[PDB]
């Protein structure tokens, strides 16, 4: 689209949306309904359905779980993939594996994104769930970035906390069934999401720089490069080698010091 | 110390939501894995006809990980909620208006058999004073003590 | 070479007999010698592997009648173990980062002693971290974020 022009706020405002608006949808229905009160039914089937489906009792159940877990890999591997790309690029549709392939795992996380939603008791505390925000905030930049002709490493971090969910995609295909290997792929799963999350997070912060300084306090670093930081700083040992410069990345790392060693100290023993 | 003082919550809060025509079922008492695994096994079986009521449990310690993977392998057809039978909130709290029935279980491996009798006499006296109309099943380990759920002025054996 | 074959020889399941440290050790240190003998040239290889046949130091003791006790048992355990385990993560940080990288055409190496790379990751294993001597190389800086994870529980546990 504008060459010269930054849209970062474009693909921002759109996960935004959903959210913030959808969910006053939410309350507005909550409201509406009070002040009108001043066999099953088809719904109900409906709903059922849907739950069984989302658990592993069938053998249409069972094939759509796997799925889950072979393309929410599938997702994290490609953003590992764009993430050596400039930070706001331009690629078209037409003529690109990638941006193609990713519509196919994105419309089927829409997909499977609804049939969660149907199965839920309360709407609003669904809504306010971790899957659902990750969901919010992945799923619509890709389309909104196929309308526009372009590109943003935005959020595309969070990804890597679709990893939480195997734990239990796994007790519900019968596979792990004893609290030793419950409480062990819990722990890994955890662990590995979290420390991928963070190092996601501080390599946008660090290579974009800082829209208030007219983004000039940019530092070239790598995914890898993060990884080892933010190990390093979970450790607590602390070399001087790398470490944040700008602002958005040192207030984040104050504020990652204060549960990351924490969680590093309890978990790893 | 603040990371632990924090995030100390019940998972298991809420209130059970009531559907229009299907009917449910409330057990508590001695909830265990082998327990419940049995119950389901026997309750949920092919033989019997096709039926739809939901199950409902109610105990007072919250489940372990095993016990809550068993729950998530009958996810669309168990639930679970954390509240002590002796407390009209937590009795409200699972709806026990409209429960067709409710189910007690016993510790029959258990070391005195006096306390347990007395304890689940007292959950049968705490629900039929919440409502003094439902159907109660309940598992007695001596037969003297038996006797004393005759003297509950709402108990009817000629009813269920 | 010898003492290799008699063990082999000694072995219940030569499998499980294969898979193990001592067996490991020894195929990865015994036949270069050779090799190099042959070749009329050297390489400073996997040789740092030499310092985990210390680990058997105990079990010698105990078959020659010396560690007869429980406590003495336990210490020499822990010392043996903790000794090689150093020892090894440094030759193998020594190797890495006096070579270079083998898809750079060894081009960023780094001039380090063994001293300086004892001392590196005692440094390290502390949780310390001065910061005057690092890994640079991509190999270097990957074996140490997989190192840290067990070195720091292994030290943390076994000193005090
Ligand atoms: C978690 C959700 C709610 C997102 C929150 C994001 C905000 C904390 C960020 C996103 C966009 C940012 C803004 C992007 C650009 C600018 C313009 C910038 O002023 C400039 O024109 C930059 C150069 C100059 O200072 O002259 C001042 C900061 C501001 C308002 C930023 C303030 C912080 C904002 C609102
Ligand atoms: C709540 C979480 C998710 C995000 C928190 C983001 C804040 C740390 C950001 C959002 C708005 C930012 C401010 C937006 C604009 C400015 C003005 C900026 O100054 C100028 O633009 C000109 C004067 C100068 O050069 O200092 C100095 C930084 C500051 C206060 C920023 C400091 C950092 C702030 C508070
Ligand atoms: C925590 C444990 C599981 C280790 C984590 C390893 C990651 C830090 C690795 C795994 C895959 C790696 C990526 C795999 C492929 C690429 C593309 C590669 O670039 C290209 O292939 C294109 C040319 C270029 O831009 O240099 C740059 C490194 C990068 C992003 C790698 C960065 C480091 C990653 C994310
Ligand atoms: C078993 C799991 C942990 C995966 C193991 C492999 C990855 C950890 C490797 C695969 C490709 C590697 C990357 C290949 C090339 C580069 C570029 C390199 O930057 C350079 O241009 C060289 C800098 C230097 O040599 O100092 C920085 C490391 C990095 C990202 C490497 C980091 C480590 C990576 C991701
Ligand atoms: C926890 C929440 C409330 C955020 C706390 C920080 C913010 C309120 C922002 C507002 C203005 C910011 C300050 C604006 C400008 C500067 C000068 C700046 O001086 C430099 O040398 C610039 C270095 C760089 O940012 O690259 C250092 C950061 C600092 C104090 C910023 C630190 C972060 C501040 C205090
Ligand atoms: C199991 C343990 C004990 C030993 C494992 C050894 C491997 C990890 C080593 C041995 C041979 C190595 C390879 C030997 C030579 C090359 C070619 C080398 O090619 C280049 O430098 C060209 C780069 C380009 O121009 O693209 C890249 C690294 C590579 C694949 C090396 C990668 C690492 C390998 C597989
Ligand atoms: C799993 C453990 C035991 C070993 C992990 C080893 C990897 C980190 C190594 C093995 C093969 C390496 C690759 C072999 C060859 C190449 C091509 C090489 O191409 C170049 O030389 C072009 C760019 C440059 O000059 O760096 C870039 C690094 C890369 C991807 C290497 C990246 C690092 C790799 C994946
Ligand atoms: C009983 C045990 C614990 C004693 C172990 C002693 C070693 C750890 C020390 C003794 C002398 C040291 C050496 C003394 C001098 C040098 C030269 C030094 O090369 C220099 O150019 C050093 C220049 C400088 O001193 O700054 C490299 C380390 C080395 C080999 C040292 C390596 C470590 C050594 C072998
Ligand atoms: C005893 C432990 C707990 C602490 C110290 C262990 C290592 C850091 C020490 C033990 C033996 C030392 C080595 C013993 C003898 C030598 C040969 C010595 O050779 C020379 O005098 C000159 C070599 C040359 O020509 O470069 C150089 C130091 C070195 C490698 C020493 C380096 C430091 C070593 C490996
Ligand atoms: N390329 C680029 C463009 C704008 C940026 O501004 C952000 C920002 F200031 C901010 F505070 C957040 C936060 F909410 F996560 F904290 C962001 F996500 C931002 F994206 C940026 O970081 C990078
Ligand atoms: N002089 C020289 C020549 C080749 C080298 O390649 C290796 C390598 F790439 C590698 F990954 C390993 C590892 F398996 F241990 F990791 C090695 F042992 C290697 F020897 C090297 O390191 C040094
Ligand atoms: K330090
Ligand atoms: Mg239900």
């Not at chain 1, 709407?123 to 899957?131: A, D, H």
């Not at chain 1, 070239?220 to 410069?245: H, I, N, P, Q, R």
């Not at chain 2, 709290?93 to 279980?105: F, G, N, T, Y």
């Not at chain 2, 919440?130 to 002025?153: D, E, F, V, W």
Request: with cysteine.
């Amino acid at each position: 689209d504008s060459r010269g022009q930054r849209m970062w706020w474009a693909f921002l405002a759109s996960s935004m949306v959903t959210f913030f608006g959808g969910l006053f949808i939410i309350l507005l229905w909550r409201t509406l309904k009070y002040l009108w009160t001043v066999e099953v039914g088809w719904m109900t089937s409906v709903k059922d359905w849907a739950g069984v489906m989302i658990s592993a009792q069938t053998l249409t159940g069972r094939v759509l779980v796997v799925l889950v877990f072979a393309l929410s890999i599938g997702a994290l591997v490609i953003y590992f993939i764009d993430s050596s790309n400039p930070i706001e690029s331009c690629q078209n549709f037409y003529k690109d594996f990638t941006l193609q392939i990713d519509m196919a795992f994105n419309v089927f996380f829409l997909l499977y994104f609804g049939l969660r939603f149907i199965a839920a008791n309360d709407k609003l505390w669904f809504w306010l769930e971790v899957n659902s925000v990750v969901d919010f905030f992945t799923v619509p930049p890709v389309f909104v970035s196929v309308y526009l002709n372009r590109s943003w490493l935005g959020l595309r971090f969070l990804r890597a906390l679709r990893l939480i969910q195997f734990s239990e995609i796994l007790q519900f295909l019968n596979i792990l069934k004893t609290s030793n290997s419950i409480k062990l792929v819990n722990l890994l799963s955890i662990f590995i999401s979290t420390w991928l999350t963070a190092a996601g997070f501080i390599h946008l912060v660090e290579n974009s720089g800082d829209p208030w300084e007219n983004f000039q306090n940019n530092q070239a670093l790598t995914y890898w490069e993060c990884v080892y930081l933010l190990m390093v700083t979970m450790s607590t040992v602390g070399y001087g080698d790398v470490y944040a410069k700008t602002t958005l990345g040192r207030l984040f790392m104050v504020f990652f010091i204060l549960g990351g060693l924490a969680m590093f100290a309890s978990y790893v023993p | 110390e603040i990371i632990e003082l924090i995030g100390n919550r019940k998972k298991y809060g809420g209130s059970y939501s009531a559907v229009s025509g299907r009917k449910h079922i409330v057990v508590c008492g001695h909830i265990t894995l082998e327990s419940v695994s049995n119950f389901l096994k026997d309750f949920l079986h092919k033989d019997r006809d096709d039926v739809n009521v939901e199950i409902v449990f109610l105990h007072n310690i919250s489940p372990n990980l095993e016990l809550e993977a068993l729950f998530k392998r009958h996810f669309t057809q168990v639930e679970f909620y954390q509240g002590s039978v002796l407390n009209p909130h937590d009795l409200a709290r699972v709806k026990i208006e409209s429960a067709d029935a409710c189910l007690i279980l016993a510790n029959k491996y258990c070391a005195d058999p006096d306390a347990e009798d007395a304890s689940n006499i007292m959950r049968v006296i705490s629900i039929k004073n919440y409502h003094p109309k439902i159907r109660i099943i309940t598992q007695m380990l001596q037969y003297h003590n038996k006797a004393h759920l005759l003297n509950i002025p709402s108990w009817n054996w000629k009813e269920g």
